[PDB]
Design a binder for this molecule. Structure first.
Ligand SMILES: Nc1ncnc2c1ncn2[C@@H]1O[C@H](COP(=O)(O)OP(=O)(O)O)[C@@H](O)[C@H]1O
Ligand SMILES: Nc1ncnc2c1ncn2[C@@H]1O[C@H](COP(=O)(O)OP(=O)(O)O)[C@@H](O)[C@H]1O
Ligand SMILES: [Mg+2]
Ligand SMILES: [Mg+2]
Lengths: 524, 524, 74
């Protein structure tokens, strides 16, 4: 359509005004004395949020030129959100500081590209320093402290995650779900569980548990449909003659087959449970091989050329116990050899390192976890749904932070870590004066998260900043108790991944915005 | 679209204005001197309501920022409505009081999050105190008193429910329906009744009752269709030879089968009634097993491998009498063993405790009630439909209150109970001054339901509040007779569930609203 | 109630206490205290109170029974 072009300072002023609008909404949610932002949803009740990425996504400014600036800073919150779950507000606050100070240098006549080169040079140097200050976190105490800080000082959320990471293991996956009651709960399942029910209720040999339990069973894994008992016969003769209970895995079971199985179980000839294969296509086939590796069995398929009629009792895996519900199937403790399990785990794990789809990478993480370790779900307890949504976001942020803390270690929280790295990098210079100004613009911006937390508390940011900078190592301000002290001892610990990610993403988006000469946008 | 962002006090003032608009409409309907609210319906006549949840749902404020506040307080009325049917006005009145007082503390410079932590601490402590003051209600007198208070001082509604709960039993379900006439009626059915009619009118052996009655019959339960008499023959020979009347249950009956049955009954060979199975799918199958457990019979199905042709007279259950209409089927007094009935009831009852769908939980409640106890329907009598709708809402509220009263006991009504708990909790303090202010904001809000009932009466709320607080135990004001006295003796009793639910839901929604810093909403 | 409202206290509680009290018991807004008003020194002439009530009622009566008002056009 018709395009209106604005040039020079006029474009930059409108661009900054939009950045300032989005940043101001995100800024109010920083630190513990930070307040919530309410986002109207067109259908349903308004959502009260303290997560910056949610606030940033919703805000679209009406003015065309101003909106373009707001959309560009929305990228830092989203990118930080994706790479490491928390750090979305710190990233936006750092980005706003670099743009505001950088625009002043452009007004002073500094070459914008030279400033961008200096800001990148300072950003790279700070990342190396943050790696040096990083201290590895593996102890439960540190995991609980990072969880509590990520959940806005919620100790219960921190300890629940520390306990869960305890039981599930490094391979194990922890998940967040809406809770049944006011109280938070943690459910951990070890062994092979998957979300498929009993085919008929007639198999129920524990009607007081509402379920089927089978003691030391053989397990049969079949490709395609079980069309008839006519395929099944020699295996049925063999298993019955041996005497053990049995679990039938197949992609479906036909009426003749299911009805005959019910007649045999009911009248006592063979003790048999029948369940459906999990998911669809290639991942169903893959998970069936993983189930076979766990049981120490063979997958019967047409591709390998295995008739169901030519299977024997050597070709069935085994487990210590199996338990099955109307929704869920679970297997306790395989006969599969541990070395074979680890070879198959190593295969699956190597494909995680190749996983372009993050959504499917999670599904690969579940397959490793079911084979080795356990999957836990955290019930999020709230009186009302509005409280449930904010409750879950805090729990999710804590799980994301705890995972990053194990991966890259921990550094002092409260923005003390960035104040420390800027102090170390003071002499870092650049080829030209404009690069030197760019290095300083980035160094001054690093103080902005600390100042904003203190401003949200109601303390004057300048006085606290100077005291913290004067102090050395982990000396910092506890915003909650409004007292100075050692941050790591006080328990204000934040991951080195979230701190580094926020700096890198903020610098990237900010450097491009300072260089902008003209803005082209559709006519109002 | 374009979003307008308001920050700080400007956002909170607009947010409070919306809360005040919704609350004011709900407030007029509190207590016995409370007046009705009329809600225009776009098609049909306007609805006159005294239930707050209905008024809250309809109100949507035109101003975008104000509407967001109104939508958020609509949650407390709806949530209280769902968990326990009554208490929707008390919840909204408490929520408005906490928000108005809490916003003043935020204006005084109190940390909003610290206030929320204190309000939650006071809310938890009060709930424990309300459990202590709770006195269990099981006597008919108390059940009638809670029913009368819930129906806005309607004694007839209270006694009808006391009598109904009497006959149906704890397992029994009481239901509310539009009444045939000006007078309210109560119909209680014991035994196995279900809503399916006679297949043909030719079976009518009582044409002066318009119906079929069969004395000491065998009952046959079949899966699928009865296709032919060719399946039926050996059972028909056996039953006729034995000589007893018979009731045929199946999912359908084909023309050849139905016509042959009519020929046999008409000409006197066998006395047989035929009826269709209730509902569809799995719950039809489940209810057919429950019917078999009651009759002391066997369900004939393909899954168990039971041919209709291979059934015998040992495989049929029996009842003392059966009676059937054009709409409804009812069975009087089974031959099924009581211990087997209780085992099957225990199975069904255990699945109630697992029931995620509340709608289907009610359907599980009916199945327990048909097997043990009875289902009653209360006819709601009114001259006009407008009066019918308000009449039924009061009857429904009384049934919800009576159910809660048996479950969690009763405490003094009129808001005297909350005044009492606040007085006990006066010393409860918090870690910081802001938490202490938050505890007091909640303690002062607890007086608001008592004050609003008195204000609706036209009495000045302040004077009565002070007299009630000065009095001890159940000393309280009877708003109707405008006289002070013992509330439990006066008969103003309300459930401990409804009182506790109103406090918990109000505190949850209110605490989040006080913390709001900014509001983002679509441009007008 | 207006004397009490202007001083920032609750009109209803003070009005009830004075109403319940006997004779000159009343609330001195200045000292924020209730006492015998004659002793406390808050004395007003009888004519002042009688005249106020009589004149106020007269305007109220004319007010209630006014059936027309004629004014010049804006
Ligand atoms: N009690 C505290 N005292 C000082 N700093 C804190 C405290 N709690 C959290 N912080 C720090 O404030 C920041 C938390 O910001 P937050 O509100 O969680 O959003 P985001 O991390 O996305 O910026 C982190 O740097 C954290 O270490
Ligand atoms: N005659 C009465 N005297 C004093 N309090 C009463 C009387 N009747 C009902 N109440 C109390 O007023 C409240 C009833 O409010 P209601 O109009 O039924 O709507 P809701 O319960 O949803 O707030 C209860 O606390 C009840 O105990
Ligand atoms: Mg965070
Ligand atoms: Mg009510």
């Amino acid at each position: 359509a018709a395009k209106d072009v604005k040039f020079g300072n006029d474009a930059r002023v409108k661009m900054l005004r939009g950045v300032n609008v989005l940043a101001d909404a995100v800024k109010v949610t920083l630190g513990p004395k930070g307040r919530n932002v309410v986002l109207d949803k067109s259908f349903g009740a308004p959502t009260i949020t303290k997560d910056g990425v949610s606030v940033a996504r919703e805000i679209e400014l009406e003015d065309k030129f101003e909106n373009m600036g707001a959309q560009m800073v929305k990228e830092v919150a989203s990118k930080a959100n994706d790479a490491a779950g928390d750090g979305t507000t710190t990233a936006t606050v750092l980005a706003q500081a670099i743009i505001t100070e950088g625009l002043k240098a452009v007004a002073a006549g500094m070459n914008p590209m030279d400033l961008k080169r200096g800001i990148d040079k300072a950003v790279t140097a700070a990342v190396e320093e943050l790696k040096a200050l990083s201290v590895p976190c593996s102890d439960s105490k540190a995991i609980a402290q990072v969880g509590t800080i990520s959940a806005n000082s919620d100790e219960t959320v921190g300890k629940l995650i520390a306990e869960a990471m305890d039981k599930v293991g490094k391979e194990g996956v922890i998940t967040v779900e809406d809770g049944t009651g006011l109280q938070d709960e943690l459910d951990v399942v070890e062994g092979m569980q998957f979300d498929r029910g009993y085919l008929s209720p007639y198999f129920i040999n524990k009607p007081e548990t509402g379920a089927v339990e089978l003691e030391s069973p053989f397990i049969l894994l079949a490709d395609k449909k079980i069309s008839n008992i006519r395929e099944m016969l020699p295996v049925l003769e063999a298993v019955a003659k041996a005497g053990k209970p049995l679990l039938i895995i197949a992609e479906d079971v036909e009426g003749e087959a299911l009805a005959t199985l019910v007649v045999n179980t009911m009248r006592g000839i063979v003790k048999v449970a029948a369940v459906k294969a999990p998911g669809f296509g290639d991942r169903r086939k893959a998970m069936l091989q993983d189930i076979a590796t766990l049981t120490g069995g063979t997958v019967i398929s047409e591709e390998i050329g295995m008739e169901l009629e030519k299977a024997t009792l050597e070709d069935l895996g085994q487990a210590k116990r199996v338990v099955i519900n109307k929704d869920t199937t679970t297997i306790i403790d395989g006969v599969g050899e541990e070395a074979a399990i680890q070879g198959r785990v190593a295969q699956i794990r190597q494909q995680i390192e190749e996983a372009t789809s993050d959504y499917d990478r999670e599904k690969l993480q579940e397959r490793v976890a079911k084979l080795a370790g356990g999957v836990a779900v955290i019930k999020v307890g709230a009186a009302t749904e509005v409280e449930m949504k904010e409750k879950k976001a805090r729990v999710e942020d804590a799980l994301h932070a705890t995972r990053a803390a194990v991966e890259e270690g921990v550094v002092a929280g409260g923005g003390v870590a960035l104040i420390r790295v800027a102090s170390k990098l003071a002499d870092l210079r650049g080829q030209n004066e404009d690069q030197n100004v760019g290095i300083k613009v980035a160094l001054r911006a690093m103080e902005a998260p600390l100042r904003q937390i203190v401003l949200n508390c109601g303390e004057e940011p300048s006085v606290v900043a100077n005291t913290v900078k004067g102090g050395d190592g982990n000396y910092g301000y506890n915003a909650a108790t409004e007292e100075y002290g050692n941050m790591i001892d006080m328990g204000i610990l934040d991951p080195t991944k979230v701190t580094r990610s926020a700096l890198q993403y903020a610098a990237s988006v900010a450097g491009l915005m300072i260089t902008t000469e003209c803005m082209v946008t559709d006519l109002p």
